[PDB]
DNA sequence: GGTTCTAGAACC
DNA sequence: GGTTCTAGAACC
């Protein structure tokens, strides 16, 4: 596509059914949910990056207009401005 | 002590032998090592904070002069300026 | 003060 | 461009 590479990766991620259990669109096709950060870093990130680093993932999500939608740091949900 | 509360927690953390396997001083008593971030967040953080959030932990370490000493984001090692 | 989301900055 | 350490900012 014409979108930034990171953005293309994210798209492949949430639209590739094999990642479904770790990262998926929300029911109302509203946002993106990562039920369990640990499982997601283990199983999904390595298919797309040489280094599996959740912090680097979140940093880039922020860079491209995604925000975290508001006890542990296990579940994560993000939504985009545009 | 007179040091900031976060700093007192960190001290209790690395000096309390029961946390030894998750967070400890380095051999040369040089820095602080967290062999496995996941185990550390599971077992150590909850004894000290209502919320176990590694990112909030790292943020505060930076706030108080600690720096990360330079494939996954599993192992972490920090050292202090002063 | 305590916490956590978002951005700066500098290295790759 | 890719990545990751450190700091700003704003809410608690």
């Amino acid at each position: 596509m014409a979108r930034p590479a990171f953005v293309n990766k994210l798209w492949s991620m949430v639209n590739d059914k094999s990642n479904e259990k770790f990262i998926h669109w929300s029911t109302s096709g509203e946002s993106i949910v990562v039920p369990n950060r640990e499982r997601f870093v283990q199983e999904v990130l390595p298919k797309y990056f040489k280094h599996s680093n959740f912090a680097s993932f979140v940093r880039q999500l922020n860079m491209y207009g995604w925000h975290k939608v508001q006890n542990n740091d296990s579940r994560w949900e993000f939504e985009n401005e545009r």
Side-chain angles (χ1 to χ4, degrees), chain A residues 13 15-23 44 47-48:
Chain A
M13 239 183 248
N15 289 110
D16 180 330
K17 209 187 170 47
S18 74
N19 300 315
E20 212 151 53
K21 175 188 178 131
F22 311 119
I23 178 160
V44 173
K47 299 148 134 228
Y48 305 95

Side-chain angles (χ1 to χ4, degrees), chain A residues 45-79:
Chain A
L45 287 182
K47 299 148 134 228
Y48 305 95
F49 310 83
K50 178 183 179 180
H51 289 196
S52 270
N53 186 132
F54 198 71
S56 286
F57 182 70
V58 176
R59 177 63 194 103
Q60 284 170 100
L61 284 174
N62 273 159
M63 214 172 261
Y64 299 97
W66 292 85
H67 306 265
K68 183 166 170 163
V69 155
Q70 54 275 19
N71 167 220
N72 63 13
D73 49 357
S74 246
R75 171 187 222 81
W76 293 71
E77 177 176 355
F78 306 97
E79 86 187 340

